[PDB]
From a paper:
VhCBP is a periplasmic chitooligosaccharide-binding protein mainly responsible for translocation of the chitooligosaccharide (GlcNAc)2 across the double membranes of marine bacteria. The chitooligosaccharide-specific SBP is localized to the periplasmic compartment of the bacterial cell wall and serves as a mobile component of the (GlcNAc)2-specific ABC transporter. SBPs share a common structural feature comprising two domains connected by a flexible hinge region. VcCBP and VhCBP belong to cluster C/subcluster IV (C-IV), members of which are specific for oligosaccharides, including mannooligosaccharides, cellooligosaccharides, and chitooligosaccharides.
The F411A mutation did not affect the hydrogen bonds but eliminated the hydrophobic interaction with the N-acetyl methyl group of the reducing-end GlcNAc. Mutation of Phe411 lowered the favorable contribution of the enthalpy change, suggesting a role of Phe411 in masking the N-acetyl group from water molecules, avoiding direct contact with water and forming a hydrophobic interaction with the N-acetyl methyl group. The effects on ΔG° in the other mutants (E10A, N204A, S221A, N409A, and F411A) were moderate, although one mutation had been introduced into an amino acid with a high degree of conservation (Asn204).
Author numbering: 1 to 61, 64 to 529
Write the structure that this text describes.
């Protein structure tokens, strides 16, 4: 049998948990591979919908119905039907802790129309809602209804719809997830098993990938041409452009001195001008990125959406200018009053910014250490922390952090970045990710975001985008640094069929949250 070695997520030890709603504690081979979506939107190719368990869908406006593919079975053998979909969406509406997106804010309810067809009722006008709906995991009703506790259910013997449901081998350091015996698309599948080794950080990953022990990965790799590519003719990669990375500052820091600094727009702009974004790219990412000098975080890949007058107005604040940063600090009134060379707050208080990035994410760790040095050059005191991801994440959810370095989801239009990074509704909820947790709130901004897909008028949507750009830019809510890359390494020793620059069928990454990985694995063939 052919075994495909993949690495979606760092772990110190595997805990057997295949619960699709528990994104913070499950294994990252659950979505897509155990639970196939209704539709995969191919985001690299204009969000072209690729139909899987649903064969079609139809909007109307307010209304949308999905037709279900008939003759699909679960891995046990039972039939896949429309009440599985209905069952699944009810669950999350009642337990909004399993809402990892904000889906409950859009869908008011769901109704079975027949054995292969389901209607979805909306809260507001949203031409983008089929994309949102595809995010919700569909689980089997003949199992999860018999389940007493979904919020804690670990689901160690999963019944799934996807290509790999069979747990063949499981240890704290290795598991192997094999083909669903009843898989509906089996004629299309040429890989027998997914092989998933425990790897805790980038250092551990590097030794393994360079030794040719991996097949499909998406980790940071330093000096990739000399370390990884040069080791074997079988060692390849392809890094299509990805999303924004930024320093995010906590507007609700509990320390008086740090709050005084972080909530000050002159201070955020001077922080931003202290940074040398191209040096960060050159050193921390070995060239693997593009400068992002948009105060709104938009990035150069959306030139067509950008209001260039706005971009030009605030670009000086997002360009390397150490002398300008020192002048702005002086003008704002951050004066050093205790002879240590670091500026103090207007109220006379000293402070040091603690900047966090996740443990093991060494490209971001190095970025933070570079920024620390650069900030010290303009008299801003900071130092780095590299906490375990869950600690890092919890600090942002609870608002106990000072500054955090983070990437963001990247979509075919600016909404994916702008909504996830700035919609204040995403700052409360216990299924919420880190991305909006600066705790800046602007009601006009939320309104513009909530209207982005409200009309089917392209010109108006463009005007809404320009308004969102204006607001974020003038308030320098975050400090955008660069636009990153979809890191992706593949090995042709054991498999062929890979997406790459000459075969760019979609986002090639193995991360959970990249639905296209289902379509990718269906293209792979054993050598
Ligand atoms: C938007 C987002 O949170 N994406 C996450 C990925 O960044 C992350 O992959 C990790 O990215 C780090 C930063 O570039 C790399 O240092 C690291 O090697 C890489 N890890 C792996 C295993 O690919 C993944 C996994 O943590 O989660 C995504 O959600
Ligand atoms: Ca195939
Ligand atoms: Ca001082
Ligand atoms: Cl290189
Ligand atoms: Mg090991």
């Amino acid at each position: 049998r052919s075994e495909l070695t993949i690495h979606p997520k760092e772990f110190t030890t595997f805990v057997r948990n295949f619960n699709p709603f528990l994104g913070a504690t499950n294994l990252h081979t659950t979505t897509d591979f155990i639970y196939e979506p209704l539709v995969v939107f191919n985001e690299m190719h204009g969000n072209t919908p690729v139909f899987r368990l649903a064969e079609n869908f139809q909007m109307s406006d307010m209304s949308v119905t999905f037709d279900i593919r008939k003759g699909v079975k679960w891995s046990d053998g039972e039939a896949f039907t429309a009440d599985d979909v209905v069952y699944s969406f009810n669950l999350v509406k009642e337990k909004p802790e399993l809402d990892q997106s904000g889906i409950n804010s859009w869908v008011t309810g769901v109704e079975k129309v027949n054995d292969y067809q389901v209607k979805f009722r909306l809260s507001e006008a949203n031409s983008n809602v089929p994309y949102e709906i595809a995010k919700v995991p569909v689980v089997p009703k003949h199992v999860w209804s018999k389940v007493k506790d979904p919020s804690t259910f670990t689901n160690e013997n999963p019944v799934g719809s996807g290509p790999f449901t069979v747990i063949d081998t499981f240890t704290p350091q290795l598991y192997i997830q094999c083909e669903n015996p009843n898989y509906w698309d089996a004629a299309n599948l040429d890989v027998d098993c997914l092989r998933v080794p425990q790897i805790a950080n980038n250092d551990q990953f590097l030794g393994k990938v360079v030794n040719g022990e991996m097949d499909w990965t998406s980790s940071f790799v330093p000096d990739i041409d000399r370390t990884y590519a040069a080791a074997s003719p079988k060692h390849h990669y392809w890094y299509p452009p990805a999303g924004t990375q930024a320093f995010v500052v906590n507007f609700k820091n509990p320390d008086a001195a740090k709050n005084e600094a972080l909530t000050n727009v002159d201070f955020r702009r001077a922080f931003s001008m202290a940074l040398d974004r191209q040096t960060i790219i050159d050193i921390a990412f070995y060239g693997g990125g593009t400068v992002n000098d948009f105060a709104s975080g938009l990035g150069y890949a959306f030139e067509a959406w950008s209001d260039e007058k706005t971009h030009d107005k605030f670009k000086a604040y997002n360009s390397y200018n150490a002398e300008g940063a020192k002048k702005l600090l002086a003008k704002a009134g951050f004066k050093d009053v205790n002879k240590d060379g670091f500026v103090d707050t207007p109220s006379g208080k000293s402070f040091e910014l603690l900047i966090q990035s996740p443990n093991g994410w060494t490209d971001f760790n190095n970025t933070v250490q570079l920024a620390v040095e650069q900030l010290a050059e303009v008299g801003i005191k900071a130092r780095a922390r590299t906490p375990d991801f869950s600690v890092y994440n919890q600090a942002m959810l609870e608002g106990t952090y000072d500054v955090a370095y983070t990437n963001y989801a990247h979509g075919a239009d600016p909404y994916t970045y702008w909504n996830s990074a700035y919609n204040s509704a995403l700052q409360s909820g216990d299924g919420m990710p880190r991305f909006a947790m600066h705790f800046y709130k602007n009601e006009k901004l939320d309104g513009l975001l909530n209207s982005f897909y409200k009309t089917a008028d392209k010109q108006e949507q463009l005007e809404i985008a320009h308004g969102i750009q204006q607001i974020i830019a003038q308030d320098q809510v975050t400090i955008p640094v660069l636009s990153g890359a979809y890191m992706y390494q593949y090995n042709t020793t054991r498999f062929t069929g890979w997406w790459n620059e000459e075969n760019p069928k979609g986002r090639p990454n193995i991360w959970a949250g990249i639905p296209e990985r289902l379509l990718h694995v269906l293209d792979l063939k054993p050598v």
